[PDB]
Paper text:
Glycerol is metabolized via coupled oxidative and reductive pathways, with glycerol dehydrogenase (GDH; EC 1.1.1.6) serving as the initiator enzyme for the oxidative pathway. GDH catalyzes the oxidation of glycerol to dihydroxyacetone (DHA) with concomitant reduction of NAD+ to NADH. As a member of the family III metal-containing polyol dehydrogenases, GDH requires not only NAD+, but also a metal ion, typically Zn2+, for its activity.
Full-length E. coli GDH (1–367) was crystallized in the presence of NAD+ and then soaked in glycerol-containing solution for 1 h before flash-freezing in liquid nitrogen for data collection. Within the asymmetric unit of the GDHNAD∙Gly structure, there were two molecules (Mol-A and Mol-B) related by a 2-fold non-crystallographic symmetry. The binding mode of NAD+ was consistent with previously reported observations, and glycerol coordinated with Zn2+ through its C1-OH oxygen in a non-productive manner or was positioned at a secondary binding site. It appears that one of the intermediate states in NAD+ access or release was captured. Our size-exclusion chromatography experiment, conducted using a HiLoad 16/600 Superdex 200 prep grade column with 50 mM HEPES-NaOH buffer (pH 7.5), also revealed a protein peak corresponding to GDH at a size consistent with its octamer. This octamerization entailed formation of three interfaces per protomer: Interface-1 in the N-domain and Interfaces-2 and -3 in the C-domain. Accordingly, each protomer of the GDH octamer could independently bind ligands, as was observed in the GDHNAD∙Gly structure.
Author numbering:
A (entry chain A), B (entry chain B), C (entry chain A), D (entry chain B): 1 to 367
């Protein structure tokens, strides 16, 4: 069938690009509603206002309630209609960004996306994940296009807690493995077609970038400063991983992430931290070579991601919980079925326990 | 400076995808002006009308005058307002697509483009070239965004003259060398910033695809059939080179192309045919290793592109003509200035004569 | 523009060459003033006198006051005019040698240079660095030629404190990295032109020599004896590094050295010890691969050079001091601007902190 | 023994650098004798006079007799004292440069040389060959130093006959093999000591430059234009081979050259043309591996150098002539004695016949 690749229309990254926001956004619309993470507005709200004002734009700022829920979106629709804005800007982490995309779609207007962390591969995709106000999965909202514009201030990312950069590394490290599995199996992507070569190349670049640059990038995030390694890892966590997962494919790592959220123990760990264990689980399923397993385990360990179930607070009733994870992972319409030859609940259960054992031996040997 | 990559929002490629234009375009608008010339509407019109009709869309077919000019745009816009079209589809070669992009810009509506050939890398880009009704360059029209949707029917492309596929290879083969040069010089790209890693990776993938698949694809093109090699070369010629040139950078090869168009002798050659000589010229300028120049000359020769001035019909008064080419290639604003260290007219002159001598020696040996 | 390489007219190294000084110097002049480091004159003054006397030359010996200042040079001019000498010999470390060059230039006579340590790349260059008597930077004196003759007694070098050989390793280890950056950026060299191939080759040889021979050479310097590894490292620290920096180029490592001298904490560390940290800082800026960073950090550590700010006594108020270092490093006319794409004060600050972190982890891991 | 490298003080190369002779030479002297023959002053004189005039210098043009002989030197010195010149500029080919170096020596003043061809490696060296007014070898004049300044206008060199560039390649291609042999035998170099690492690295760079760039440069030479390949070959032919031979060492190839000049048949060939056969002779003597001899024969053949005795017009009485060559090459004082293990007349005789047979087989295969 057809080969399809999707992208945001334009992706921009640079130090202090928050000062140029207005100038980049001006071609899209004159009037703007900003949906902003509260923490971020706390240090940056004047800077944002000045950026728009200097470009001759009209802007109103709405603080974000914190969850991408139907209620929050509806609240923001009300504010948007009153403002009669021609476009939405999301500025924050993934929850803020998914909310802005959904809002913009319901208002039928352009959306710009300004990640203030590089924590997940949400920013670039044509998808918003909707939750209940209690923080539970509600539904996927499939958008007819990717954001018009994605603008990443690398200095703001560098000032955020380093754990959130690690989390994004854990999210993005899965990308190549999942897109390759889908290539091998011939699976349809979220873009609705088979893999392009472009998408697999970006997915592989993502993996190699993290291997070469991940540890260097963490030194910079820990000191809250911008270096070339950090710029490269931000691009990987954001553009490469975004295009790679959506237009290259999802498989076991994401299915296992979803499984793990059915366990209360891990629910407050970051998306990428759960994806990280999902990647190790996937390498058991696809029987990756010893040196590949070790390379991934070593990078994950070096940036502080979990490589064991105990690092996700899964310490008691492990067999029973892994049954739950395995069943959820193989539910109808999960992406585990994109693996070459598929995966049964028993195969995933087996992979979970064995990945945990590999993690546990890796750690012991590290003293 | 910021690092920027731009892309069409969605790129789709597949055999007989023209049957699916409706389902794919539906999410963007209900009412469409379809702009195509007589020849294309000749084979395509009834298929388009049925695909749109079955998706529940409205179409207004507007035969195209053949030239991308302000008058032609105004006329078509005339027709589009009357019909109350929400979106433009261009279907055909580069002049038709250029026109649909410009029209859609002036009317503030989305654009889809459906190339029926793969002969240049211009289609996916955020640029429209405006011409006189007589066919002379008027001005470049910079667009605020790349086409919303690009849809390539590989079966229609396979039916086009094989010469046009080779010409496309000639245009796309420059991509890597020009992006690499701009990366070495730190030049600004047409997307408005410095190179992303993503853009450089797609430019290099373009090059490697053409090396690996070029000759195989030309066998398919000459038999007018679709193979995976042809599919890959079409992607390289269209998506990879489009992103590579616009977000990776242009340099000497394109500037030499422009110089060659000041020479009446070379008027009957396609864009990519002149660019193919420009690439060899560039490799002399940057003093590429013998093995690289030989690889490029061999691929160019194997798919029928020119590697000498005589194969562009430049046979008489060659010194005098190359002074003209060199002076034009080095005109203020030209992309030759993106080469590391720049290039003077004298340097470009020298490279033109030596690239020609190199091509001549290469042809002599080949027999 | 023009490609230029500069050299001393003749470079000589050998064990006990101090005995052949007179014979080597005789073609330049009959009457000589020797400007001599006091420590050196303390053990070698009779040997020097005998060398000249045996060759039939006339010599007068002036002990060097210790700083290359305008006053010291003026004092020595007075002595030289009275002596009516036809040439100057400098014998000592870098401060003695720069003084002799400056003196010889002001008297308009030939200069010979006899390093008694291999501590910096001063000896061979067409430059004298002038200081205040208080030991502060005054001005660069650009000489119209390099020394006529450079004569290195490898046994005298071997008898000096081993720390001063390490210091020279730290000075010379920067050479390849800086000349390569300048090659990449197209920067002008101190010789006034673009890089020759000759200069880059000598710069690269310098780096590879230190990697292969640095540790072996330190064993010999510690035992105060001459081996082939020591002879090779002396040549690297003196001729290779001299030609390499002047005719290949300076970039971030030297700019960072200059920054660090604005900090009182490090002021009494040797030139090369500060350059060593500057090299690690540069490898952050140019995003060197992990294995290159590690190779350089390991060699620097093995010969006793600093790889952390604490090893230069920068232990308190580090952020504030690194702002100072970064601003000085990027001052107008510094060589940091020779890096590909340049470097802002923020980029250099970032590189300083991250290089320090890499150093600190390297040391921790070394237990 | 001491390790010594000698070099010209400053080497400058660039297109149209003749326009900058004044600014570059100013630092050495105010008043100049410019020595050039009719032909060179023919194209160069007005340019030189304007460059000097604009720098504020005085010039006295002294047309050169064509032969480097004691009479010619005395005459010119005559003119130089009258004019009260502080420095000599030689401009032209090797006989003019030789003369300027010798003159400047006898008058005790600095010398600048501006080669208008790149056909031998003699220009940069500290040696002048003196001849009879009739053109016969009189004596070698050893100079205490290399030229103060060497200035090569690559655009003038590109205008010279292509044959002279190839001849230069022939002269420079020996450099690495002769320096390597002297390094293996421990022979003393013309600079008066054992090999430095620097000199061996420049000799090997010369070889690799010619391999990589030789054929490319010959295309530029034949079109009479400047490319980077030509620039690199000019540097190899002039600076790298000059330092390589004088500070690296001469061996069999030069001795064979000398032997070949005792044979009237080879009189119409350039120095580098005879040396090219001498190199192949040397590779037989040292029993170089088949792949090395083939590489050298192929490069020599590709740029038009002789690889057989017939291509030096030695066609009759070849055994008898090769006895003469072998005896002369092995004369007391000749450099063949620097080969590891030495060489007897019989060994050299054998190598000459076998090198010829090798060349003949190589030409037969090539068609
Ligand atoms: N749509 C997709 O394709 C896709 C893909 C992956 C993940 N997601 C979604 O992404 C969400 C997770 O995003 P997230 O982990 O970024 O959560 P988030 O948006 O809640 O951000 C995490 C935390 O980071 C803080 N933060 C943000 N910027 C900061 C800054 N500059 N300095 C300091 N703190 C800062 C926020 O205040 C917040 O507390 C989930 O809802 C998940 O479903 C969507
Ligand atoms: N200087 C220039 O103007 C220049 C230079 C180089 C390339 N080009 C490009 O080349 C084009 C020139 O050709 P054109 O304008 O006449 O375009 P065109 O559309 O007429 O090109 C040939 C056509 O034949 C069609 N075709 C033939 N048999 C077919 C079959 N069996 N099934 C399906 N399709 C079939 C192809 O699909 C294609 O549309 C330009 O539009 C431009 O894109 C232009
Ligand atoms: N001109 C240039 O291109 C260039 C390049 C680099 C550095 N420099 C200059 O070099 C200077 C630093 O030179 P340095 O570090 O050699 O300083 P230095 O000349 O003061 O020598 C350092 C110490 O070594 C001692 N010493 C010298 N020879 C000895 C021996 N044989 N045995 C024992 N002790 C011996 C001296 O007495 C002195 O105390 C600075 O002024 C710097 O600006 C110039
Ligand atoms: N046995 C020998 O004497 C021997 C052997 C081998 C090589 N050589 C070398 O070759 C030389 C022989 O040639 P020559 O002495 O007649 O030297 P020459 O200077 O006349 O050589 C040719 C000249 O043509 C000039 N030229 C021609 N067209 C030009 C243009 N358009 N622009 C600029 N310059 C242009 C070149 O610059 C060059 O100076 C010797 O001087 C020596 O260096 C000598
Ligand atoms: Zn994810
Ligand atoms: Zn093009
Ligand atoms: Zn230094
Ligand atoms: Zn020679």
């Amino acid at each position: 069938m057809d080969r399809i690749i999707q992208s945001p229309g334009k992706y921009i990254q640079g130090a202090d690009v928050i000062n140029r926001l207005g100038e980049y956004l001006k071609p899209l619309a004159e009037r703007w509603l900003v949906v902003g993470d509260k923490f971020v507005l706390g240090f940056a709200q004047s800077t944002v206002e000045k950026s728009f004002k200097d470009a001759g734009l009209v802007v109103e700022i709405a603080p974000f309630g914190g969850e991408c829920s139907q209620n929050e979106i509806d609240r923001l629709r009300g504010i948007a209609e009153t403002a009669q804005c021609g476009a939405i800007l999301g500025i924050g982490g993934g929850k803020t960004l998914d909310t802005a995309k959904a809002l913009a779609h319901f208002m039928g207007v352009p959306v710009a996306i300004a990640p203030t962390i590089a924590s997940t591969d949400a920013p670039c995709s044509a998808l918003s994940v909707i939750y209940t106000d209690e923080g539970e999965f509600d539904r996927y909202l499939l958008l007819p296009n990717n954001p018009n514009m994605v603008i990443v201030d690398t200095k703001i990312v560098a000032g955020a807690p380093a754990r959130l950069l690690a989390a994004g590394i854990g999210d993005a490290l899965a990308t190549w493995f999942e897109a390759r599995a889908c290539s091998r199996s011939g699976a349809t992507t979220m873009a609705g077609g088979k893999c392009t070569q472009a998408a697999l190349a970006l997915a592989e670049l993502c993996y190699n970038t993290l291997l070469e640059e991940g540890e260097k990038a963490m030194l910079a995030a820990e000191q809250h400063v911008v270096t070339p390694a950090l710029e490269r890892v931000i691009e990987a966590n954001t553009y490469l991983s975004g295009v790679g997962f959506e237009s290259g494919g999802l498989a076991a790592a994401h299915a296992v992430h979803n499984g793990l959220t059915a366990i209360p123990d891990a629910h407050h760990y970051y998306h990428g931290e759960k994806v990280a264990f999902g990647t190790l689980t996937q390498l058991v399923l696809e029987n990756a070579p010893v040196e590949e397993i070790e390379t991934v385990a070593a990078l994950s360990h070096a940036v502080g991601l979990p490589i064991t179930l105990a690092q996700l607070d899964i310490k008691e009733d492990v067999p029973a919980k892994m049954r739950i994870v395995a069943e959820a992972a193989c539910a109808e319409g999960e992406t585990i079925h994109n693996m070459p030859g598929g995966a049964t609940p028993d195969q995933v259960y087996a992979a979970l326990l064995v990945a945990d054992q590999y993690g546990q031996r890796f750690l012991q040997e590290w003293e």
